[PDB]
Design a protein around this ligand. Structure first.
Ligand SMILES: CC(=O)O[C@@H]1[C@@H](C)O[C@@H](c2ccc3c(c2O)[C@H](O)[C@]24O[C@@]2(C3=O)[C@@]2(O)C(=O)C=C(C)C[C@@]2(O)C[C@@H]4O)C[C@H]1OC(=O)/C=C/C=C/C=C/C=C/C(=O)Nc1c(O)c2ccc(O)c(Cl)c2oc1=O
Ligand SMILES: CC(=O)O[C@@H]1[C@@H](C)O[C@@H](c2ccc3c(c2O)[C@H](O)[C@]24O[C@@]2(C3=O)[C@@]2(O)C(=O)C=C(C)C[C@@]2(O)C[C@@H]4O)C[C@H]1OC(=O)/C=C/C=C/C=C/C=C/C(=O)Nc1c(O)c2ccc(O)c(Cl)c2oc1=O
Lengths: 450, 450
C-alpha cells in the first residue's frame, strides 16, 4: 500500500513492470495485447482477479496521469473525462523507454529478490532504478500523497546532494522549486511547497490556466463541467490538439469549483521496511544511497561473470590448441564420465595460446591446484564438461577466432572492472554520469508554473 | 456456447485443459496453484477476466458435478450445498489421469489448430480424445442438455457400433440403458430415455433415494432443505462418509420438492461447425469417425517423424564412422558455411555401418540425389548442419552406441508403422484396442438405478 522510497513503486506496479521485463515486452519490439501481461501478472505475481492489475497498466500509460509514462500504450486508454479504457484484449502495450531505466541491470544481482506467492518464482523486492521515480511520478494512497516533479530538476537536485551532502532544503530548492504536473496549470502556495520539502507535509493549491486551457492534476474535465452547470442553480471545445473549455465570475468559479483544488502533500514511503514521513532531502539521500548499492553490486556481478566466462574460455582455447589428442582421448573414452575424468587427470600444454594465457582473471572460488601452472593447464571438471559440450562447428577458423577474441575482450573488461571497484572516486563517478545521462536522454521542460 | 460433438467440450473448457497440458500440469507431477492456470488461460487463450475460467476449473474438479473429473483438485472446491470454492490463489490442481486420455496425441498433428485471439499462439479446434466425453460427462447451456453416462457402458456401445454400423437404437441400449449421474439416485421414465436416444429429445425424471441418502443431479442440498422448511407453512446429518438427511409425507415431498426433478434431454452439439440435434447413434458415430481421423493422422505423423529422425541419424553415424577426415575437413574450413558446403560437396564411404545402412526409411520429401547411393553417402545441407551441431561427447563409446541403437529401433518402428498404415484391418484394430484399454483402465460401476 505504500510506495518503496527507492523506486517509487507499490507491489502491484512492480509486479506489472517485472512481468513486462520477463516477457521481453520492450520499447523496441512489437506491442503485445494487454491481456497477455495481465494474465502473466495474475498467474505468477499478483494472484487476484479484480480490476487492479489492468487499472495499473492503464494509469501507467495515460499522459494525463503519469508525468513520465512507464507503459507505452496504443489504443483507447481512456481520457481526462473519465471514460474507461477499452478492454484488455483490445489495447496494446510495451515498456516505455524510461521504464527500461527503472529496471536497468535487474539481471545483474543488483537487488534482493523475494518468493512469489506459490514459491515457484522470484520477484524483485525493489527495482534497480536509475530514475528517481518516487519524486518524478509521485504516489498516492489512502496514507501518502506525493506529487510529480520534473526529471531534469530532480536529477540536478540529486547531483547537488552528491556534491554536498550537507546541502540545505533551500539549496535543494534552487534546483527543485516545486512539483510539475503532467497536466501543467499553475501552483499557488510557495510556503506550502517549502513546508512539504522541509517536513514532509504541506498543503498547496493548484489553479487552472472565459477560456480554460489547463486544469488541475487529477481533475476530471467532464465532472468539472457538470459541477459548473449544477452550481448554476458553456461548451467543451477540447480536441486532440489541446484543451479548450468555453464559458467577475472567474474568481467565483475558482472559489467554488475544481478550477482550483488543494493538494495536501504527505510524503510517506517505505524506508527500510517501515513507513516513514520523509522530507525532500531524505528522499534524495535514499535514492542516491540506492544507486551506490546498485552500482557496487552490479560491478561485483560483472567482475564475477566475466571471470567465470574467461575461465570457461581458457579451457576451450586449450582444447582447440590440442584438438588431435582431445579427439583421441574422447573417442577412446567408454562414456562421457570417463572422458571427463581423463581430461582432468593430466594437465595440457598451452601451444600457440601460451602468450595469451600468461592472476586478475581467476575466479575467486578457484582453488590453487587449477588453471595455468608452470606452462601447463590443469582443468576443473566443469571446464572438462564445457569441452565435452563443444559443437564440431567451433573448430572452424572463424568460430575459433571468435572465442579467442572474446577472451581477449574479457581480460580488458576485467582490468577495467577492478579499477572501478578499487576506487571510490571511479564508482561515484559512474553513479553521477549515469544520472547526468538520464537527464540528457529523458529530461524535458517544466509544464506547471509555480 | 455449444459443445463439440467429438470431445464434448466448449471453448472455455478446451482452453483450460489445453493450458494445463502446455504447462506440463500432469497427473504425476506436483499440484500447481489454480491462479497459475487461470493466468495462463486469460493471457493466452480466453482473454476475459470474469469468473468463468476459474468456475470451469472448479466444476471440472467437483465429484458431484462431473461423472469423470477432468481436474484433480486439492483444497476447498465447494460442496453440494452450494458454498463457493476457496479463491484461486489457495486451491491446487493438476490434470486428472483421464484428462490425459482426452488429450492423448495432441502433439502428433492429430487435430487442426486455430489462432488464438492475438495471433501469437495456436489452440486446438478439438481434442484428440480417446474418451467419448460428450456422453460420459454430458453438457448443458442456455440450448443443449445432455446427461452424463457410465464409461464402461458407453465404450461397449462404441465397440458394438464399430462391429455393426447398422446397429439399431434398441441394439445400442443393450449396452447403454440410460444416463449415470455422479450423484447416483434413481431414474424413473424409461420411455423418456428411449425417445432421447432415438430422436435427441426426451424428458426424464430423477428421484432421490424419512432418511435421504442420494439426491438428484444438480440439486443443491441446502436449498432442498430450505424448500422443505418453507412448504411447511428435519436435520442434515451428512458428513465426509456420505449424505444423510433426516426428516405418507414422502410421496408428497416427491410431488412438490426437488427430491424429484425433471431432466429435459436435448442433445444439441456442434457437428461440422453447425449446431445439430443428434440421437445416440449420431453421437457414437461422430466419436468413432473422430477416432478414425485421429489414429490415421497420428500414424502418418509418427511415420514422418521417425523417417526424419532416422535420416538425421544416418548422417551422424556416417560422420562418426569418418571421424578423422570429418575433423580434418572442419578444422580447415574458414567458417561454418564453408564446412557445410565441404561436407555436402563429396559423398562419404560407409565404413563399419555399411550393413546397417543398406527405401522404407527415406523421408518422402528426400530427392533421389541424396542418401546412400552405390555404397556412398550423399549428405543434404540439413544433415551437414546436424554434424556441425554434434557435441564432442557424442564421440564417446556409449553415446556413439546409443545413436546406432536409436537408428536400429527406428527402422523397426518404421516397418511396423507402414504395416499399420497399409492395412485398414490393423488401423481399425488399434482404434478398438485403444477403446477397450480405456474401459479396462477407467471404467467403473454404474451409480444411478434406472
Ligand atoms: C484490500 C483489497 O482491496 O483487497 C482485495 C480483495 C477485497 O479482493 C481481492 C479479489 C477481488 C476479486 C476476486 C478475487 C480477489 O482476491 C479472487 O482472487 C478471484 O479473482 C476472483 C475475484 O473476483 C474471481 O472470482 C473472479 O471473479 C475473476 C477472476 C478472473 C478470478 C476469479 O474467478 C477467482 C479468484 O479467486 C483483491 C484484493 O486486492 C489485493 O490483494 C491487492 C490490491 C492492490 C491494489 C493496489 C491499487 C493501487 C492503485 C493506485 O496506486 N493508484 C495509483 C495512484 O493514486 C497513483 C498516483 C500517482 C502515480 O504516479 C501512480 Cl503510478 C499512481 O498509481 C496508482 O496506482
Ligand atoms: C456472453 C458473456 O457472458 O460475455 C461476457 C461479457 C459480458 O463479459 C466479459 C467480461 C467480463 C468482465 C471483464 C471483462 C470481460 O470481457 C474484461 O475482459 C476485463 O476482464 C475485466 C472484466 O471485469 C477487468 O476489468 C476486470 O474487472 C478484472 C480483470 C482481471 C481484467 C479487467 O481489469 C480488464 C478486462 O478488460 C466476459 C464475457 O464472456 C465471454 O466472452 C465468454 C464466456 C464463456 C462462458 C462459458 C461458461 C460455461 C459454463 C458451463 O458450461 N456450465 C457448465 C455446465 O452446465 C456443465 C454441465 C455438464 C458438464 O459436464 C460440464 Cl463440464 C459443464 O460445464 C460447464 O461449464
Amino acid at each position: 500500500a505504500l510506495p518503496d522510497v527507492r523506486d517509487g513503486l507499490k507491489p502491484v506496479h512492480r509486479r506489472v513492470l517485472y512481468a513486462m521485463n520477463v516477457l521481453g515486452n520492450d520499447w523496441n519490439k512489437a506491442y503485445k495485447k494487454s491481456a497477455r501481461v495481465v494474465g502473466d501478472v495474475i498467474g505468477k505475481y499478483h494472484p487476484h482477479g479484480d480490476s487492479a492489475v489492468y487499472d495499473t497498466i492503464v494509469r501507467m500509460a495515460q499522459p494525463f496521469s503519469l508525468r513520465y509514462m512507464l507503459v507505452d500504450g496504443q489504443g483507447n486508454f481512456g481520457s481526462i473525462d473519465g471514460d474507461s479504457a477499452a478492454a484488455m484484449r483490445y489495447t496494446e502495450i510495451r515498456l516505455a523507454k524510461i521504464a527500461h531505466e527503472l529496471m536497468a541491470d535487474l539481471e545483474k544481482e543488483t537487488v534482493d529478490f523475494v518468493d512469489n506467492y506459490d514459491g515457484t518464482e522470484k520477484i524483485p523486492d525493489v527495482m534497480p532504478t536509475k530514475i528517481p521515480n518516487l519524486l518524478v511520478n509521485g504516489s498516492s494512497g489512502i496514507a501518502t500523497n506525493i506529487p510529480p516533479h520534473n526529471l531534469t530538476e530532480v536529477i540536478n537536485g540529486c547531483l547537488a546532494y552528491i556534491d554536498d551532502e550537507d546541502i540545505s532544503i533551500e539549496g535543494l530548492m534552487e534546483h527543485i522549486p516545486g512539483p510539475d504536473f503532467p497536466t501543467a496549470a499553475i501552483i499557488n502556495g510557495r510556503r506550502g511547497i517549502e513546508e512539504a520539502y522541509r517536513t514532509g507535509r504541506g498543503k498547496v493549491y493548484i489553479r487552472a490556466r472565459i477560456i480554460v486551457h489547463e486544469i488541475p492534476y487529477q481533475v476530471n474535465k467532464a465532472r468539472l463541467i457538470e459541477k459548473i452547470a449544477e452550481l448554476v442553480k458553456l461548451r467543451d471545445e477540447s480536441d486532440k490538439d489541446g484543451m479548450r473549455i468555453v464559458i467577475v465570475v472567474l474568481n467565483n468559479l475558482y472559489s467554488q469549483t475544481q478550477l482550483q483544488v488543494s493538494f495536501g502533500i504527505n510524503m510517506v514511503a517505505l524506508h527500510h521496511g517501515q513507513p516513514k514521513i520523509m522530507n525532500l532531502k531524505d528522499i534524495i539521500a535514499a535514492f542516491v544511497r540506492h544507486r551506490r548499492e546498485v552500482v557496487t553490486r552490479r560491478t561485483i556481478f560483472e567482475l564475477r561473470k566475466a571471470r567465470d566466462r574467461a575461465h570457461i574460455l581458457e579451457a576451450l582455447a586449450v582444447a582447440l590448441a590440442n584438438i588431435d589428442p582431445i579427439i583421441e582421448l574422447i573417442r577412446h573414452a567408454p562414456t562421457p564420465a570417463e572422458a571427463k575424468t581423463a581430461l582432468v587427470a593430466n594437465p595440457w600444454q598451452l601451444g600457440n595460446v601460451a602468450a595469451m594465457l600468461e592472476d586478475a582473471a581467476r575466479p575467486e572460488w578457484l582453488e590453487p591446484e587449477f588453471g595455468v601452472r608452470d606452462g601447463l593447464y590443469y582443468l576443473t571438471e566443469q571446464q572438462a564438461q564445457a569441452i565435452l559440450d563443444l559443437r564440431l562447428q567451433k573448430l572452424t577458423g572463424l568460430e575459433h577466432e571468435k572465442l579467442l577474441d572474446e577472451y581477449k575482450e574479457l581480460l580488458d573488461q576485467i582490468a577495467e572492472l577492478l579499477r572501478i571497484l578499487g576506487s571510490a572516486d571511479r564508482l561515484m563517478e559512474v553513479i553521477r554520469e549515469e544520472l547526468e545521462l538520464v537527464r540528457e536522454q529523458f529530461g524535458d521542460k517544466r509544464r506547471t508554473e509555480i
